[PDB]
Symmetry: D2
Subunit: 336 residues, 4 copies
C-alpha cells in the first residue's frame, strides 16, 4: 500500500522532507515537486537522486492526477492558498506549522476541508510525536499525578539572528508550547499574559527573554519562560503539577564525564536536533493511516486555528501590556 | 562565651534551647521564659538544663547575667520583646517573621537605631543552608551573568484545617520573600497572586497559588506554592541569568533500581529540610558577637522588607490585582 | 542507487530485519527470502505485504541472479555455510552476531572472504551504532579523560527462560560487551576470568549472577557484572576510567514523577527496546557504503573471530575456575 | 559530662581536640599528650583550651580526671596506649586503624576482655555517614533482596610522594574493608588485588588498584581504588541484590547550565566528604556512655577484622595471587 505525494515549497525544510519522504517514510512516493524560485526544486531533486516532475505553479501540481497527497512546506504567506486548492481538488494535505498566520486564513482551510466531508488535513506540530511528550501525555491521561493544576515550561535557544523580532518569540517559538500544552492537557486557553523580565544586556535586536502566563478554560495555570538568546544551548522544559504529584518531561540523554572537579553532560545547541526523530514519526503515522484508509490522527486544521488565535492574543499582550482574552468558536463536530 | 536568655519555650523554643545549650559554642543559656506556667521548666527538666526561670520576660531582660536575648515567642510578643531587649542594650536573635505588622518592624528598627549599633538578627535560616550559599556564590561569581528570571517552588504534603489562605504568604512564602531578595540583592516593586484551579483535595484554603514578583530592576520571579501537594516537602529554586542557569540542589538520597523504576526519596517532614541551618545561623551569630563584631545575618531592615512584601501579597490575594510594593529609603544604618 | 537483498532465516529477528529492510532502510530492496521451516518465510512476507521470491534452499537464494546482498539471520549453526556460499558467489554479506560459535567456523568465512580479495562482510554487533556508544567512543578518542585504565560494565536483564543455560550468559549476552569494549578501547583481550558471586535464590535454572574480569593486551582492566535474572528490568552500564577523568555511558531518557515521597523514572524491561534504533542505523550505514561503491565499515569477519575466541575462553573459565588465556593469531592486513 | 584526655595532637588530634571541646556535648577535654615538645600546647594555644599537657600518655591515663582516652596518635602507638587505658579501666575511642598488625589488635582484645565490659570504639566514621546509614537501611529492609554483588570506588585527586603502594590498602581501602563488612553483616574469605595499566601521571606507587573480595557467603565485592584520579574525591558504592540495586548518594551540589554543558561540582578536598560523620560518631559514643551504655560503634573485633583482611590485601599485592582471609571464631564478648 503506497501513496503519491506532491511537495510545494522546497526551502530549508522542503528539502529535508523531500529526502524523508523518498528515503525514510514508507507507503509514500514523491512524484511532484514545486518551488517559486527558478532552480530550487530541481536542485534538491538533484541533490538526492530523486525523480519527480517539477512545477512552477502549485496549481498544476495539485491538478496533476499522479498527485494524491499535497505536502506544504512553502512560506507561511502561501499556506492557505495551497491548502484550499488541494482540498478543493479533493487531495490530502500535510501542512507545516503554523497553518497560517491569521485566524481567517485558517478558517478558509477549515471551510475547504469540510466541503470534502472528510478530515483531510494534518499540521506539522511534531512535538506530539516526540517520545518524551508521549510518555508525559500517558502519565497525565493515566491519572497518576491526578488533575493538572499548574504547568511550568521553558523554551530556550542559544541565539537569534537580527531579523527575528519580538513577535517571533510567539509566532515561531512559543507556538510549539501553544499547541503542545493544549494537547497535553486536552484544554483550550481562556487568557494569555506576556511579562517582560529584565532585558538581556547581550541582546539588542528584540525583547528577550519573555515570560508568558496562560490560563486554560478550567483554570490550569501555565507559565512558560521563553529565552531565545540564553547563550548556553537549546533546552526544553515541561513540568506538570497535578493534585497528587508532578510529572517532568525528560531531555536528551548524554554521556557524562567526571573531570577537573566537575560532573557534566552536554546540552544540545542545534535546535534542529531536538525533535529531529519526530519528523519521520509524524509522517509515518500520517501515511500509515491514509494507506489504511483512515483519517489522519495528528494536529488538525482546528488545532492550527487554535494556535493562530492564541499566538495572536499573546502578541496583542506584548503590545498592550495587558492580559488578553482568547476568543474561539465552538469546536466543530467535524473535528471531534 | 556569651550568656543568653530565651524568650518563649514552645515548639521551636525548646529546640533552640537544646541547640544553644548543646550544639552551639560561645554560648550558654542562663535564663528561660514562657507565659504558660510549667512550660519553660518542663523543657529545662527534659534536657537537664539549669537556667533561671522567668514568667515575665522583662525580668529575663533585666537579669544582669543575660547578655543576648533569643526570641522564640508567638509573633504577637516579638516586637514587644525585641524593643525591651534593645532598650536594655542587649543583642537580639529573633525568629522569623520579625513582627505581625510592618509598623511593628518600624518599632524595632527605631529601638535598634537608638542603640546606634547593629544588634538584631532574624531567623531566616535558608540563607545559611549550604545549598543556598553555593547558589549565591555561583550567582555572585558571574558564571551565569546577570539574573533575569527566577522560578521557585515551595511545596508541602498537607496542612491542618487551621492553616488559612493568608498563611500561604505569612508562614510559607515569607521564606522565599527573604531568600530571593538576598540572592539577587534587590527589593520588590510588584507582586501578583494567581490562583490556578483549586485542588479538590483541599477545602480549608486556596491552594495552590502562583506568585509573580518583580524586583526593582525588573527581574521576574515566579513561585509555585502548593502546601497540599501530597507527595512531600520539596523546594525548588532555579535562576536564569543572561548566559546560564543555576539550580538549587535538593537533599541527597540513596537511589534504588527495582521493579522497572529508578527512584530516590523525597522528604515528607518539613522540619528536616533546613534543620542544619539552625545550628549554622546561631554559630555565625555568636562567632561574630564573641569576636566583637556585629551580627551579619538578616537585619531588622530585612524583616521590615519581608513584612511590607508579604502584606502586598496578601492584599493581592484579596483584590485579584497586581499590587505595588512601597518602601522608604534604606537607612544607612542597615547598609 | 539500490541494492537487492536475499534474507536467509526468517525467524524472530529475520522477520524484524525483513520489515526494516523493506520499509525503513533506503538503498535496499528485498527480492528473496528463505527459511528451512515450511511456510515460515511466506507467512512473514504475508504479514508484511512484501513481494519476494521464496526459496527453500539458501543455495538457490544465493545463486538467484537478482540477489546482490545476502542477509544472514539464520540459526548460528548455519552462519558459516551460508556466509561461505555467499562469498563463493561474490555477493556481499551482512551476518547477525555471532559470526559463528567456533573459531574454526569464523576462519572458514575469513578464508572465503579473502579468496574474494575484497572486504564484503559486516557482523550485526549493533551496539557500535548506538548513539550513546558513539558518543562515549568520541570522548575516549578525543583524549578528554586520558588513557583508559579501568572499565566497569553491567549487562542486566530481568529474567530468562529455563532453556537459557550458564554458558549463554557469555554466548548470548556478554558477547555484546566482548565486542563493544574492544571497539571502544581499540584493544584485544589477553585474559579472562569468570567469578560466580553468591547464587540468586530466585534462580534455579543457571548460575546467576556472574562477574567477569577481562584484561586487555596493554593491561586495561575490565569488570562486567552479568545478572540476567535481576528482576528489575533491562539495564546496561558502561563506565571508562582514564588517567584524568571518567566517562559514563548514558541510559534511556524517561519522564520523571514526584509522587508519594518518591522521585522516579522508568527502567526498560523489554531488552529489544534498548538498541532498537541501532538496527536501522547499522544497515543504513551498510547499504550507504555499498551503494557508494565502498566496502562495509562495520564489525568485520575478524571482529567476529575475536568475539568467538574470547567467548570461548570465558566459557572455559566457567568450567575450570581459572583465569584463561585468549589465544589469537595476527590480524590479517586484509582486515585493517 | 564525661572527661577526656587525648593522646597525640597531630592533624586529626587537634581537629578532634576542637570537636570534643566545641561541638560534642557531654564531654570535657581535661588532658592532652604529644611526644613532640610544644606540639600539644600549641594546639591548646590555638583553640584557647584549658588542659593538662603530658609528655607521657601513662601519666595522662593515670589522671583521676581522665575517664575516656581518645587515641589520635600514630598507628605504631595505638596498641600500647589502648592496652594501658583498658588496664587502668578507662574507655577508649581509638582512630582507625586499630593497629596495623593483627597481633596488636589481639593485645587490645585481650586487654578489653580482661575488663569483661565493652569499652573500645574505633573511628571508622563512614558508619555514621547519613548516606551510608540510608544505604544500610535500604539493604536491611529487603527492598533489593539478598545482596550478591557490590561495586565500590575510592578515588582521590592526587597523593604526595611519600604515599606508597601498601597505603592504598592500609590508609584508603581500609574504609571500604570495614564499611562493606558492616553493610553486609559479613566477613571476608578471599581477597585479590589486580593491577590495571599504571597511570602515567603516577610515579610513586602502583595506581590504580582493583580489589576483588569474597565474603563468607560468596558475595563478590569489586572496589576500584584510584588515589591520583586527578578529578577529585569521589566515593561510589552500589549494592546489587536479588531483585534490585541500591546506590550510595554523593554530596549534593547546585547545578549549572552554561556553554552547552550541564554540570555539578565534585569535591576535591578529601576531608570534606565525611566531615559530619566525625561529630556524629563522637556524639553517639558520648551519648551512649553518658547513659551508662556500652559503645555501639565499631569494636576492637571490627579493628581486628579490618587488620587481617588488609594484611591479606597487601600480601596479594606482593604475591599477585588470591589470598585467603583466616579468621578465628568471633568471641561472644563482641556479639
Ligand atoms: N519544526 C518545524 O515544524 C518547522 C521548522 C522550520 C520551519 N517550519 C515551517 O516550514 C515552512 C517552511 O519554512 P522554511 O524555513 O523551509 O522556509 P524557506 O524560506 O527556506 O522555504 C520556503 C520555500 O517556499 C517557497 N515558496 C513560497 N511560495 C511558494 C509558492 N507560491 N509555490 C511554491 N513555492 C513557494 C520559497 O520559494 C521557499 O523555497 C514554514 O511555514 C515554517 O513555519 C516548520
Ligand atoms: N523555620 C523557622 O525559622 C521557624 C520554625 C518554626 C517557628 N518559627 C517561629 O518561631 C516563633 C515561635 O513559633 P513556635 O512554633 O515555637 O510557636 P509556639 O506557639 O509553639 O511557641 C510560642 C511560645 O511562646 C509563648 N509566649 C507567647 N507570648 C509570650 C510572651 N508575652 N512572653 C513569654 N512567652 C510568650 C507561648 O506561650 C508559647 O509557648 C514564631 O515566631 C514562628 O514564626 C520559625
Ligand atoms: N541483538 C542482536 O543482534 C540479535 C538479537 C537476536 C538474535 N540475533 C541473532 O540472529 C540469528 C537468528 O536468531 P533468531 O532469534 O531470529 O533465531 P530464530 O530461531 O527465531 O530464527 C532462526 C531461523 O533461521 C532458520 N534457519 C536455520 N537453518 C536454516 C537454513 N539452513 N536455511 C534457512 N533458514 C534456516 C530457522 O528455521 C529459524 O527460523 C542468531 O544468529 C542470533 O544470535 C541477534
Ligand atoms: N578519617 C579518619 O578516621 C582519619 C583521618 C586522619 C587520620 N586518622 C588516623 O588518626 C591517627 C593520627 O593521624 P594524623 O594524620 O593526625 O597523624 P599525625 O602524625 O599528624 O599525628 C600523630 C600524633 O601523635 C603523636 N605521637 C606519636 N607517638 C606518640 C606517643 N607514643 N605518645 C604520644 N603521642 C604520640 C605524634 O607526635 C603526632 O603528633 C592515625 O592513626 C590515622 O590513621 C584517621
Ligand atoms: K495583534
Amino acid at each position: 500500500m503506497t501513496l503519491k505525494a506532491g511537495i510545494v515549497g522546497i526551502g530549508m525544510i522542503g528539502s529535508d522532507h523531500l529526502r524523508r519522504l523518498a528515503n525514510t517514510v514508507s507507503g509514500v512516493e514523491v512524484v511532484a515537486v514545486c518551488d517559486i524560485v527558478a532552480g530550487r526544486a530541481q536542485a534538491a531533486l538533484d541533490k538526492y537522486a530523486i525523480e519527480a516532475k517539477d512545477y512552477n505553479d502549485y496549481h498544476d501540481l495539485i491538478n496533476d492526477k499522479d498527485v494524491e497527497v499535497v505536502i506544504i512546506t512553502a512560506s507561511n504567506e502561501a499556506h492557505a492558498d495551497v491548502a484550499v486548492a488541494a482540498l478543493n481538488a479533493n487531495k490530502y494535505v500535510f501542512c507545516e506549522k503554523p497553518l497560517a498566520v491569521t485566524a481567517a486564513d485558517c478558517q478558509r482551510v477549515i471551510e475547504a476541508e469540510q466541503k470534502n466531508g472528510k478530515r483531510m488535513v494534518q499540521i506539522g506540530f511534531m512535538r506530539r510525536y516526540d517520545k518524551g511528550y508521549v510518555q508525559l501525555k500517558n502519565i497525565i491521561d493515566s491519572g497518576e499525578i491526578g488533575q493538572p493544576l499548574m504547568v511550568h515550561g521553558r523554551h530556550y535557544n542559544a541565539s537569534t539572528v537580527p531579523e527575528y523580532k519580538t513577535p517571533q518569540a510567539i509566532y515561531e517559538t512559543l507556538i510549539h508550547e501553544i499547541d503542545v500544552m493544549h494537547w497535553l492537557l486536552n484544554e483550550d486557553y481562556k487568557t494569555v499574559k506576556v511579562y517582560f523580565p529584565r532585558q538581556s544586556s547581550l541582546v539588542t535586536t528584540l525583547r528577550d527573554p519573555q515570560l508568558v502566563v496562560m490560563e486554560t478554560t478550567s483554570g490550569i495555570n501555565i507559565v512558560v519562560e521563553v529565552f531565545v538568546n540564553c547563550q548556553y544551548g537549546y533546552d526544553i522544559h515541561c513540568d506538570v503539577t497535578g493534585e497528587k504529584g508532578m510529572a517532568e518531561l525528560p531531555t536528551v540523554a548524554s554521556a557524562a564525564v567526571r573531570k577537573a572537579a566537575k560532573y557534566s553532560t552536554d546540552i544540545l545547541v542545534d535546535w534542529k536536533q531536538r525533535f529531529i526523530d519526530a519528523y519521520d514519526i509524524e509522517f509515518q503515522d500520517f501515511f500509515d493511516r491514509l494507506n489504511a484508509g483512515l483519517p489522519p490522527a495528528g494536529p488538525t486544521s482546528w488545532d492550527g486555528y487554535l494556535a493562530a488565535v492564541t499566538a495572536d492574543a499573546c502578541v496583542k499582550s506584548q503590545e498592550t501590556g495587558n492580559t488578553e482574552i482568547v476568543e474561539l468558536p465552538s469546536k466543530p463536530d467535524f473535528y471531534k
